[PDB]
Amino acid sequence: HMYHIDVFRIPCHSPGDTSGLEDLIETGRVAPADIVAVMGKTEGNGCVNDYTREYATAMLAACLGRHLQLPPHEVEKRVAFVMSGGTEGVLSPHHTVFARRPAIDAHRPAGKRLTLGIAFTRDFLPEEIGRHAQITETAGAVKRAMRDAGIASIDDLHFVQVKCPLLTPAKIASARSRGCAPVTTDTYESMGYSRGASALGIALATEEVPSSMLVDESVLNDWSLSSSLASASAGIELEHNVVIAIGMSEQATSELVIAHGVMSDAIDAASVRRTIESLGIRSDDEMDRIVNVFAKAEASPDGVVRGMRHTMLSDSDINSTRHARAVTGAAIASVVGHGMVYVSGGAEHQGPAGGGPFAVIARA
Amino acid sequence: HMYHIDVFRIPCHSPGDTSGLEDLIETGRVAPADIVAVMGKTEGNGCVNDYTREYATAMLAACLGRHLQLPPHEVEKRVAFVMSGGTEGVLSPHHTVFARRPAIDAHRPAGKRLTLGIAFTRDFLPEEIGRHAQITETAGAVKRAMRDAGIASIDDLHFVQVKCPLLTPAKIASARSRGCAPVTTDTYESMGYSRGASALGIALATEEVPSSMLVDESVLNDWSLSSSLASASAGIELEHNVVIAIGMSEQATSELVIAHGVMSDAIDAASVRRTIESLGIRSDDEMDRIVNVFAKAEASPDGVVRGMRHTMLSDSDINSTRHARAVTGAAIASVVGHGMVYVSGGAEHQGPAGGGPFAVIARA
Amino acid sequence: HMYHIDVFRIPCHSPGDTSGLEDLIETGRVAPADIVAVMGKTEGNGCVNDYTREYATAMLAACLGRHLQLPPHEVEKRVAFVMSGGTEGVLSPHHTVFARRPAIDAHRPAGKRLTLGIAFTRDFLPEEIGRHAQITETAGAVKRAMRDAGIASIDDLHFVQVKCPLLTPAKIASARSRGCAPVTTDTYESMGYSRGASALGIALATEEVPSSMLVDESVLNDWSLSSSLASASAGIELEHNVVIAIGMSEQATSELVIAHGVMSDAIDAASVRRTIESLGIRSDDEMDRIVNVFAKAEASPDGVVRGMRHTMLSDSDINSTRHARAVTGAAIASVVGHGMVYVSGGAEHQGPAGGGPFAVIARA
Amino acid sequence: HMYHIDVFRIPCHSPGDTSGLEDLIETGRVAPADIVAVMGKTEGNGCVNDYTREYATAMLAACLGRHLQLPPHEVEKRVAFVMSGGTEGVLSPHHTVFARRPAIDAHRPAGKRLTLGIAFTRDFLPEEIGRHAQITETAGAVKRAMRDAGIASIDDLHFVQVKCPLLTPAKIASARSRGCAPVTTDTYESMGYSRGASALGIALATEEVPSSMLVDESVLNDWSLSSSLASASAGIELEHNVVIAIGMSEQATSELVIAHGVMSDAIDAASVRRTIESLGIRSDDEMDRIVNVFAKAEASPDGVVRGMRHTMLSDSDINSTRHARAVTGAAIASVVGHGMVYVSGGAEHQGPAGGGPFAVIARA
Ligand SMILES: [Mg+2]
Ligand SMILES: [Mg+2]
Ligand SMILES: [Mg+2]
Ligand SMILES: [Mg+2]
């Protein structure tokens, strides 16, 4: 488990656009067989009926499938695809492509460097979403991803991305047909339950929350339970959980590092600046050292931001995660200089209530 | 309890428009002091952040307050205001004004005529919404309204309209502060719980459902529990339930009658036609005998309509009640010839699952 | 130009679902090489940022590309793909697959039978959308499609479907870079201009409107100019026009016929019934003879439906075409018994203002 | 023209909430008769069908009408009501109340202080919206407001707020009935034309743009024409323009000052910080000296922000002004510490294209 990790941020002109990926392959900057993960922001609504996520995955998988002579559905078992919908405000649609090669023999860099690992859970029954089985299967996968990454301790883990399912009327009906009530009958609400249970699974694996407290009733109820490393995104496009663990290793030769922090609320640009500063990026001209920023955002569940009422949870036209992405995307863009950053909404049990974890990948 | 009921359908050019009501008063067609209820369709989204409902009520109450020399808030205790938001598709914003006078001392033939009565519940605590207290307080109010209407038996009851509250983040927080979790933390979902509990309250009062089955867990879970007379509408503009009971009486002298039926699903125009036909209205040129139609509509919770998948419960841009109003508004309009009809979304425990009750008021 | 046409309506569980098409191929009901057109309803918003249309096309093209050993982009030059987004209310997502074979030698059926032909225009410059070039290139394509169909006269033409482009900010900027103002700077409005110019192109080819009147200024301004056969759908997924001409021929051996009519407004179910009746379908049990219904719907541009104000053109949350599809989908569903029908919004110069053309394909 | 201006920022729990205003009156902090303007942020969609703006005005006017013994409609001729809808992201609904008294007869130091003046135009015909008449009538009103404010020169003018009308289907039909086509047939687009023409009117009055260039065709086409002081907001609730001119005067005794600047784009928090700094506010604990911030925001019409594509003008679910308010609200909140600030969307001819003017009122 000694690797060289490459990370590329590539613009997308639309959800099905693979021209940027093709360019990386054609110019020899990446080998198709080395790609281990793709984290995307796609311009659908990021909620239940967002098929831009599935479409992006389909086109990426087809693209790599051609180069590898594999069917797309096989590529999806090989590569961790995490498509986060919703690019509101200044958020600019893009992919972050992660490639993994054996570590360079020429030993060795001056400190720890970027490493990455992936894992998958089994498919979940509808009645398991938002509940114990999702928590525990996720925890297992997180540990597997950490091992796959060669991450020696929790101190060297900086970001855990999870893609998770949601409920549809068909799945709700299937659940009821077996005499099992699902966690909710509202499809939008189901996304929060899925994200939350997945995030608690991360907290379990990382020992940030003791196992004793992770009863079904705690999901979306107990705000004090969280992982400071967790980034969960729900979608209609899958029935299982996909896990990407990102961290640092002595054995890695990557020309990249990662640092993480937590935004105390949706407008906490100060925390983002502090983390960027910690990576030695201390002027606006040094911002180009950042490969990407990955952040969680949410509508504060108490209905207020720094003492002032917000409307994000009472707005029946625009769902709360859409508002939250718009806000945090803008806050982060005001720091780094543009909106081509990964911002994902719904931060249930991810960082503080009303806040969320974030990570920054930068040139070493 | 011997009345003459007048019913007027008046167009609104916007939510605050009282010009039509003023015209009825100025031309002597109605006396302000005789008005007992107003049922409106207002052109907000009909969901959580729809303030067109409150605005319409405020302007109507101010209008009548001037004529009666009362403060608006006093008028609201005197008159049952039920503002149902959401006028999608061909739905045309309007008010239906109900006026009550002592029965007229003159000959009328054999045959029952339109009667109406109103009632109010106490304010509900946030934690009571969607639960036992809402069910039982509603049941009490329904019986009071029936008595107020002079409705002798359940057979002579044709429509029970209820306006009910919903949850906001502030109310959810208040509930939690007393150690009582609310029925849901999703503000949109709370509207369904409120409507559903209120409708079961109606079912209790009318003996359509036995009291034994009305446990909290049955709300939104047990589809087989319903009232065939119930029409419930949730709103941000009130903390209590408002009840209007509409029916028929031998002692009433109204030049109007009412009949009711049930739509088996959102496109069951056939049932609406059958009820209209039962009132002696057969041809298209006899449709002008209808004063108004009042109908409940909903997205079929099994996710299908007559065997075909629908998207109304998986659409994160347009909420299910907006879709349902559009559909049933169109179905009804295709029969009666226009969209100036009362169609209200979310028919939890109101008629069949996926369907809803409706009533027709017509010239005698 | 003597054909046998097969038409299949197949449900979709999501935009990328090709399982139904595969089933038709696997059971020998259709040969991949015989498929000439697919008309789909996909569950995106049907407006500017609907990528469900492109996704559906991509997956269908990939599916057929495998069977034909062709790249998907080649399949799109061979098969006319028309994906109409927006499945509001009871509208059920589906594809209608059209296959064409040489006429059966066993001559010959008792009257004219279903025939079909296709054509494509060149790509349009952004500044050509909504204008003369789009009108005239469309007219050319319509005549080519009619010839391809073996349609002898205009009397035997029953439906002309066109898929057309729209404007994005990038296209608007490109136009301005050449010193040419586009027809509009509003991306949503551009869809109506594209549909309208395309529809007038149809009217030109069919001689329903004289060429003298088709100046640029008439597009979206002169309501009296229209085609009673035209069905136009705009989308982000293409830069050219795709044309499908559907009609009747003596030379065709298809076990199918087509009839067309016009809805005078969005709730004119009566006209739909009349056309269905003309095909010998005269009871509810005979409705299963209908393969599909294809209809245009729109928000009445005068702001009223049968004398009553509507809100479809003043609603900033839900665009007018979404409302219109919900309404007409419901009206038609109330007749045929379900919502798995092709209903497309925005009927500029298509039938009467506020109305639209429709066609019914039924078993002979 | 020698005044003392008081400015109060008061939270609103809903659009009709006047409890905060009542509190200011009851505690003697403001006299009802001294109120000259109210600028509000209301939680409707801020677009065409937002009646929260009218509702807020109605309730404020009714509140003050009671204290002044005037009918509400008379209060609206006395007080400049500017209600800007749309409070997306962290934007917190509130009113800013402006009161004017004769200059206080006491010592104050050297240095200009806050002054304010108001004006109204005549009602506009639908066909005048977005055109010459709106431009020139606005210019007249701006000069009148400046005079009313006692603003000696353009150098002492810091903010010009204008409320302006929009088009509805009824108004479009009325225009066409007189043979005058309106500037657009899209109701949403009409808001931009109204704002733009109004802003150019401000530019005319302030000599930032020469009269020669202000032809009808320049509206929304020529991005190089703008006012750096203009803040225009369109609404359904009025048919005329309302003007508030805010500036500085030697003759004013207000315990307040104002400064203005321009955001180069929607995420230009740096410019906001610079202006705040110029008022002697440097640290986070000095931010409480700011009474309010008033800012214009818009979706960059070239479709990019700092070189990266944005989706705000291609999003058919969420209109561009909603996105823009969310973004700039967040950017500003990240500086001042909360979202209870006036942010208004659609900055056509207001500051740079993609940017907008802003002003800050702070304690002297
Ligand atoms: Mg959180
Ligand atoms: Mg029901
Ligand atoms: Mg038409
Ligand atoms: Mg600007």
Q: Please, could you describe this protein's structure?
A:
Four copies of one chain form a homotetramer. A four-stranded mixed beta sheet of chain A has the order 1-4-2-3, with helices on one face. In chain A, strands 5-8-6-7 form a four-stranded mixed beta sheet. In chain A, strands 9-14-10-13 form a four-stranded mixed beta sheet. In chain A, a hairpin with a 2-residue loop joins strand 11 (304-305) and strand 12 (308-309). Chain A has helices spanning 19-26, 52-68, 72-78, 132-149, 169-177, 187-205, 269-278, 320-336; strands at 3-11, 35-42, 80-85, 94-102, 113-120, 157-164, 230-234, 242-249, 256-263, 290-297, 304-305, 308-309, 342-345, 356-363. Chain A has eight helices and 14 strands. Chain A has 364 residues and is α+β, with helices and mostly antiparallel strands. The first copy, chain A, folds into three domains: 1-107, 60s Ribosomal Protein L30, Chain: A, CATH 3.30.1330.170; 108-254, 60s Ribosomal Protein L30, Chain: A (2-Layer Sandwich); 255-364, 2-Layer Sandwich (60s Ribosomal Protein L30, Chain: A). Chain A is globular. Chains A and D meet through strand 12 and helix 8 of A and strand 12 and helix 8 of D. The structure holds magnesium ion (MG) (4 copies). One magnesium ion binds next to loops of chain D. Chains A, B, C, D: Homotetramer. Chains A, B, C, D: Its EC number is 3.5.2.15. Chains A, B, C, D: One of its GO terms (biological process) is atrazine catabolic process. Chains A, B, C, D: Pfam families: Amido_AtzD_TrzD (PF09663).
